[PDB]
Amino acid sequence: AVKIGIIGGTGLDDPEILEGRTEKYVDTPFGKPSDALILGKIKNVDCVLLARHGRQHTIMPSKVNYQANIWALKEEGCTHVIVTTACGSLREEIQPGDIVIIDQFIDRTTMRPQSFYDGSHSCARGVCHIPMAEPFCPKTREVLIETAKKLGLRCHSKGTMVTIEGPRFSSRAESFMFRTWGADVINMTTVPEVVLAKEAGICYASIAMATDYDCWKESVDRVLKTLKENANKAKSLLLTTIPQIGSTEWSETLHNLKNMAQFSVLLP
Amino acid sequence: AVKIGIIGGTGLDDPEILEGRTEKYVDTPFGKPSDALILGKIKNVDCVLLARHGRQHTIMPSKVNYQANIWALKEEGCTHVIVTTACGSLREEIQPGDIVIIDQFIDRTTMRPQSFYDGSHSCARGVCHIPMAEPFCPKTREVLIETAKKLGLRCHSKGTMVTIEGPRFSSRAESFMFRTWGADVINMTTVPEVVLAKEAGICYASIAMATDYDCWKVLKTLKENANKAKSLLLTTIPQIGSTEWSETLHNLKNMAQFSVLLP
Amino acid sequence: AVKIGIIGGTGLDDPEILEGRTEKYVDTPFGKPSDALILGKIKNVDCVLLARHGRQHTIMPSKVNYQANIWALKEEGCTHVIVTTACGSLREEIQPGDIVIIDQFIDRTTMRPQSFYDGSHSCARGVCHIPMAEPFCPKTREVLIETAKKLGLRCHSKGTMVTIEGPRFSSRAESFMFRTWGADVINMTTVPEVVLAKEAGICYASIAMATDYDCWKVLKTLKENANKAKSLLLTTIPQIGSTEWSETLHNLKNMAQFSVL
């Protein structure tokens, strides 16, 4: 019995994707989420859609309440969270329009809370050191990859996302430097989203859409065109991927995530 | 009608550079600037001088009000902001006493707001993703570069500045690490000043003065550097005032306005 | 005359270490330290033990009040602070159970104040730029190195620590990239602890105990490390007591004072 959190970023602020949709506002112990939860369905599978930046795209990446967002999805009984993110490419072979099913991340954020266990909440007591060797759910990633192959989508099977604080773009020096650190794509929103998802014991996976090369590489209209196409690629990828997920067993996987998440907490 | 904002850093807390000096505190939606603005002129060019750390150098770099400093200068009607910075050298060929007219930076700061568009000020609404592929004004830089040449100053034409949070200096491991990153010089104040200037649509350039090599390899050199930097400024500013800036300024403002996503 | 501050990290939250335990809760202009200072002696050397995370290990690395901790140890008269840290290893040659008398750090923290001189406390006036070229006391590190040999402990003589913000662990890609930066071991507590000890003019060194390989490549080896660290401390501290320091502290004290503008 699965329930799929879906976080929609840039170009997917308010996407018509769910059947039988209901609007639901919640509060959480970490504050309010970016916008109403959108309860709904794809084929037979229960989904919950949420606009990372709010449905009018009014919340900058530094100010996204990632804690509230993941907590609200957890609380609504989500088993998976699949997200999208418009990103810059740091690699010749990752072309504008390409999907990257990222497997790793490099944190360059500085102002964002990264744990539920901050010692200030009684819903999250103790000190948690969550493991990050494998931040993304490999089975959910496997299905995303398989399904994009089916759809005939240009797709990369792994990649390391460097997440910057923003809101500014990179400098050229930084773009070049990120390359030397082994980053493949860049954005402002993966961290700490992915980190909090692990703490919450939720299978998390990210659909990264390369909207353009970052400034290392030697037109707004071209970028907005790429971005709109990318959004439609991502929409089908989700529409086709989510029913595949709803047709396999997950209690196996989910028991191991819930355990890694409990076992990272140190009691007083 | 240019008007040059000038931000004095280490060694330039309280220089006497302007004619017809006048002084006033000013307010901004972002808080108090580091100190009173000093108004005055260099030849026929209107200038605004501001001490980055206060005139008594009382403000540490993580505590500098970058937003108010740049907003103040903008509201005063500045077209340009030319700044000095006392830096360390990460490169053998950038010798103590050299000037670097930097053209890139790497961010190592952790505590500083980098945008006016934080969602909480009526004067800056929207989400702004400002491009930083080319963070300093190349045209302002080019005049600085040419003027340094005419003055016979040891001057490098470009360089990448790594801005650390501070106020502590870098470990030796860190200094070596920054070299592997392609950093050329190191300081505490370039980020976010430079980012906020672009968001403001002001032409920004930075005269960086190597006081020493960083620890991978003070006071007297620092005094000589301020005097070279002051000379560069006195000679550059009348050149900026004698050339045309409308298209440059129009390109900056358009890029900035284009960066802003409204509801 | 010397007095040895001792900060105990993970596995050393409340060690049975000092002769004649006297419990002293203090306050500082930066807040309360993680817990009571424990006063005591080891072979006639005046010591002050402190639990980094509190005696029940309740405070996470990001929330440790490093300013209150260093300041309290300093007011107490400490000439030296020797600390323990439970770390990950980023090198094949640094195995679980090995000790590393670290000599460098790479800062990867984001949330943490790294100075006393913040312009808001009158006990610490002005702008201070503390040199960090040699963050750890070479004198104190040597004594620790010799003793560890004398004790039969696997021990590396130098090493660069990367201090990440946490509380999460590193991703693989971060862990590979730290190696290429030149880090050898990875923790969450060294920075700004080391930095504040320098400002304070106190001799600082750190016993880093590798509990595992970080993910580029358990609870048992931690308990064993704890023991090895206790030993190293019990034996190291009297050697320091029976050596001369006047010149070292003078130079530390002077560098600290000349860093303030």
From Swiss-Prot, chain B:
<keyword id="KW-0539">Nucleus</keyword>
<keyword id="KW-0660">Purine salvage</keyword>
<keyword id="KW-0808">Transferase</keyword>
<feature type="binding site">
    <location>
        <begin position="212"/>
        <end position="214"/>
    </location>
    <ligand>
        <name>substrate</name>
    </ligand>
</feature>
<protein>
    <recommendedName>
        <fullName>S-methyl-5'-thioadenosine phosphorylase</fullName>
        <ecNumber>2.4.2.28</ecNumber>
    </recommendedName>
</protein>
<keyword id="KW-0007">Acetylation</keyword>
<dbReference type="InterPro" id="IPR010044">
    <property type="entry name" value="MTAP"/>
</dbReference>
<comment type="pathway">
    <text>Amino-acid biosynthesis; L-methionine biosynthesis via salvage pathway; S-methyl-5-thio-alpha-D-ribose 1-phosphate from S-methyl-5'-thioadenosine (phosphorylase route): step 1/1.</text>
</comment>
<keyword id="KW-0328">Glycosyltransferase</keyword>
<dbReference type="GO" id="GO:0019509">
    <property type="term" value="P:L-methionine salvage from methylthioadenosine"/>
</dbReference>
<comment type="function">
    <text>Catalyzes the reversible phosphorylation of S-methyl-5'-thioadenosine (MTA) to adenine and 5-methylthioribose-1-phosphate. Involved in the breakdown of MTA, a major by-product of polyamine biosynthesis. Responsible for the first step in the methionine salvage pathway after MTA has been generated from S-adenosylmethionine. Has broad substrate specificity with 6-aminopurine nucleosides as preferred substrates.</text>
</comment>
<dbReference type="GO" id="GO:0032259">
    <property type="term" value="P:methylation"/>
</dbReference>
<comment type="similarity">
    <text>Belongs to the PNP/MTAP phosphorylase family. MTAP subfamily.</text>
</comment>
<feature type="modified residue" description="N6-acetyllysine">
    <location>
        <position position="43"/>
    </location>
</feature>
<feature type="binding site">
    <location>
        <begin position="52"/>
        <end position="53"/>
    </location>
    <ligand>
        <name>phosphate</name>
    </ligand>
</feature>
<dbReference type="Pfam" id="PF01048">
    <property type="entry name" value="PNP_UDP_1"/>
</dbReference>
<dbReference type="GO" id="GO:0033574">
    <property type="term" value="P:response to testosterone"/>
</dbReference>
<feature type="binding site">
    <location>
        <position position="189"/>
    </location>
    <ligand>
        <name>phosphate</name>
    </ligand>
</feature>
<comment type="subunit">
    <text>Homotrimer.</text>
</comment>
<feature type="binding site">
    <location>
        <position position="188"/>
    </location>
    <ligand>
        <name>substrate</name>
    </ligand>
</feature>
<dbReference type="InterPro" id="IPR035994">
    <property type="entry name" value="Nucleoside_phosphorylase_sf"/>
</dbReference>
<dbReference type="GO" id="GO:0017061">
    <property type="term" value="F:S-methyl-5-thioadenosine phosphorylase activity"/>
</dbReference>
<dbReference type="GO" id="GO:0005654">
    <property type="term" value="C:nucleoplasm"/>
</dbReference>
<feature type="binding site">
    <location>
        <begin position="85"/>
        <end position="86"/>
    </location>
    <ligand>
        <name>phosphate</name>
    </ligand>
</feature>
<dbReference type="GO" id="GO:0070062">
    <property type="term" value="C:extracellular exosome"/>
</dbReference>
<keyword id="KW-0963">Cytoplasm</keyword>
<feature type="site" description="Important for substrate specificity">
    <location>
        <position position="170"/>
    </location>
</feature>
<dbReference type="GO" id="GO:0006166">
    <property type="term" value="P:purine ribonucleoside salvage"/>
</dbReference>
<dbReference type="InterPro" id="IPR018099">
    <property type="entry name" value="Purine_phosphorylase-2_CS"/>
</dbReference>
<dbReference type="GO" id="GO:0005829">
    <property type="term" value="C:cytosol"/>
</dbReference>
<feature type="binding site">
    <location>
        <position position="10"/>
    </location>
    <ligand>
        <name>phosphate</name>
    </ligand>
</feature>
<dbReference type="InterPro" id="IPR000845">
    <property type="entry name" value="Nucleoside_phosphorylase_d"/>
</dbReference>
<dbReference type="GO" id="GO:0006139">
    <property type="term" value="P:nucleobase-containing compound metabolic process"/>
</dbReference>
<dbReference type="GO" id="GO:0004645">
    <property type="term" value="F:1,4-alpha-oligoglucan phosphorylase activity"/>
</dbReference>
